[PDB]
């Protein structure tokens, strides 16, 4: 492939460099339309800018935490982090979010990796070996109430059991209801005067719940869960302007008030180098 062809002096009536940008086109002008060039080859394919590659590496999408401790006398397991659930969602940690929102609709399969590490912040004789059980919990699904409910039987709901310190990995097909996931949605769930707005009414994959299977030892053990997400088989439509201001909320486009100028001011003139 040639990156530049050889081209010499020109004295024409045919001027490729004068255009009318009002038309909305970006005319494909090249170095050889306005200087004299020599042949050179590309030596490159643009492999690593493919959208499959761009969205295809694992990104941290969520960090939560649960603890193993005596539940005796706990009136609210959920509240003691005896188990914790995650309203699933992919636009909470922000690095991956800016990447996805370069597109309007996106479609892909997900590969999740879940790393779990334990901490024992206060005096323990040892490190126990805990097994985590993260189980999928889609909408209209009996929800776990205690850390050892009938729910955890999970007879119809996919669940994975792995050890703290290890990693769990599985992949979920594209579960969207439509043909693509909306990265943006300028609508409502119905014509209500006070209903919410934006994507949150559409992204409704339900939630993911974690717990330790082990009963309690004499000390307490903090287990912190990190969920990583990798898109595989990516398809993206309609590019948009990149995110400039900071994010404030999952699912709304809102930016913070009295934010700071995002364009760097010159130290000098327009004329400055």
């Amino acid at each position: 492939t040639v990156a530049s062809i050889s081209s010499g002096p020109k004295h024409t009536q045919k001027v490729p460099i004068l255009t009318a940008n009002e038309t909305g086109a970006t005319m494909p002008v090249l170095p050889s339309d306005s200087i004299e060039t020599r042949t050179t080859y590309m030596h490159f394919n643009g492999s690593e800018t493919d959208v499959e590659c761009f969205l295809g590496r694992a990104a941290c999408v969520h960090v939560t935490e649960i603890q193993n401790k005596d539940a005796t006398g706990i009136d609210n397991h959920r509240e003691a982090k005896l188990f914790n659930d995650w309203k699933i969602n992919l636009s909470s940690l922000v690095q991956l979010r800016k990447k996805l929102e370069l597109f309007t609709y996106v479609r892909f399969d997900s590969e999740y990796t879940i790393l779990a590490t334990a901490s024992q912040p206060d005096s323990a004789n040892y490190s126990s070996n805990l097994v985590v059980q993260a189980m999928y919990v889609p909408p209209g699904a009996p929800n776990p109430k205690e850390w050892d409910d009938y729910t955890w039987q999970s007879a119809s709901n996919p669940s994975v059991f792995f050890k703290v310190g290890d990693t769990s990995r599985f992949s979920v097909p594209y579960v969207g209801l439509a043909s693509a996931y909306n990265c943006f949605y300028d609508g409502y769930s119905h014509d209500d005067a006070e209903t919410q707005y934006g994507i949150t009414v559409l992204n409704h994959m339900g939630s993911m719940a974690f717990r330790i299977v082990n009963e309690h030892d004499e000390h307490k053990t903090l287990v912190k869960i990190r969920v990583y997400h990798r898109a595989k088989h990516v398809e993206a439509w309609i590019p948009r302007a990149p995110r400039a201001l900071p994010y404030t909320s999952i699912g709304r486009t809102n930016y913070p008030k009295n934010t700071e100028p995002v364009i760097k001011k010159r130290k000098g003139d327009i004329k400055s180098y």
């Binding site: 306005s34 200087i35 599985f170 992949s171 043909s179 309609i238 100028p261 995002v262 180098y273």
Partner: protein, 236 residues
């Protein structure tokens, strides 16, 4: 039972590896795809669309006005604007090109810089745009500027002029984050003759300026952008 040996790296999680995994939802059938206009396949497809450069960066809070390069009637010989070409920083940085370049470590290729004139139709002007390849200082006067890559632009019916910064380089890749060895030059613009307004007309006229990449362009070695960060996880 077949005998095996495990190598160094067993059990590691590399966020960039690509392997098979069990599906959690065995046998599930995804929604059919329907047709949607606009599919993107390569980021190289989109960095060829031009977008506006806030060249007039001199303000103090972001404003629509930093997209406008002003022009003065009757000045002769003088300089319209100047900038270095660190596409990952400075004026370029918020443009779509600048914004994507920042997802990669290295770039190579030609850039297309165009200026669209917005003055009254009955006015006229001749400007010179000059590209100064690495190695010399930003030009200080047109004489200096005109000895490097340049285009005399004659403002006419055809409203825009497309200047190309041809890839001039020893090393075949430059860093997107600004660094010296790897630096690309300067871009300046001067009156060639001068802007002239018709009667009954007055004041400043402005040029809009765009930037996009030539088909020439290469970007490689993906990394994280300095353009976005956060202090606590967001919630709904």
């Amino acid at each position: 039972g077949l005998p095996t040996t495990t190598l160094p790296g067993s059990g590691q999680f590399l966020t960039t590896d690509d392997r098979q995994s069990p599906s959690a939802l065995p046998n599930y059938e995804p929604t059919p795809r329907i047709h949607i206009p606009g599919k993107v396949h390569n980021l190289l497809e989109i960095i060829q669309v031009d977008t506006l450069i806030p060249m007039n960066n001199t303000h103090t809070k972001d404003e629509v006005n930093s997209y406008l390069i002003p022009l003065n009637a009757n000045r002769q010989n003088e300089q319209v604007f100047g900038t270095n070409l660190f596409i990952g920083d400075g004026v370029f940085k918020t443009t779509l090109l600048g914004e994507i370049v920042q997802y990669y470590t290295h770039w190579s290729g030609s850039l297309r810089f165009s200026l669209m004139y917005t003055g009254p139709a009955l006015s006229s002007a001749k400007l010179i745009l000059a590209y100064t390849p690495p190695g010399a200082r930003g030009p200080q006067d047109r004489r200096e500027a005109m000895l490097g890559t340049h285009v005399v632009w004659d403002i006419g019916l055809q409203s825009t002029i497309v200047m190309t910064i041809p890839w001039t380089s020893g090393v075949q890749f430059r860093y997107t984050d600004p660094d010296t060895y790897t630096s690309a030059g300067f871009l300046s613009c001067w009156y060639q003759t001068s802007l002239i307004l018709p009667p009954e007309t007055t004041g400043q006229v402005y040029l809009l300026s765009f930037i996009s990449a030539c088909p020439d362009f290469k970007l490689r070695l993906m990394k994280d952008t300095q353009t976005i960060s956060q202090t606590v996880a967001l919630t709904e």
